């Protein structure tokens, strides 16, 4: 039963505070789009330790 939860990612200079009913994507809405979702590569490559770092 041992397991891992790996890669929503979002980059911003704005402070987001989730609520009790907050969904995954409310970060982008709360920041008025003053940020970006992480690249596809972040979801693909950060799930194991190897030489492929996501910048």
């Amino acid at each position: 039963f041992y397991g891992h939860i790996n890669m929503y990612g979002y980059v911003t200079s704005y402070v987001y505070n989730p609520g009790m009913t907050s969904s995954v994507n409310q970060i982008s809405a709360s920041t008025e789009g003053r940020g970006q979702e992480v690249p596809t590569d972040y979801y693909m490559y950060t799930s194991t330790k190897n030489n492929n770092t996501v910048e």
Binding site: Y8, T21, S22, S23, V24, N25, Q26, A29
Partner: peptide, 11 residues
Amino acid sequence: DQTSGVPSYFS
């Protein structure tokens, strides 16, 4: 709409 991770979120 408060279903996390859907295209119609907050619509």
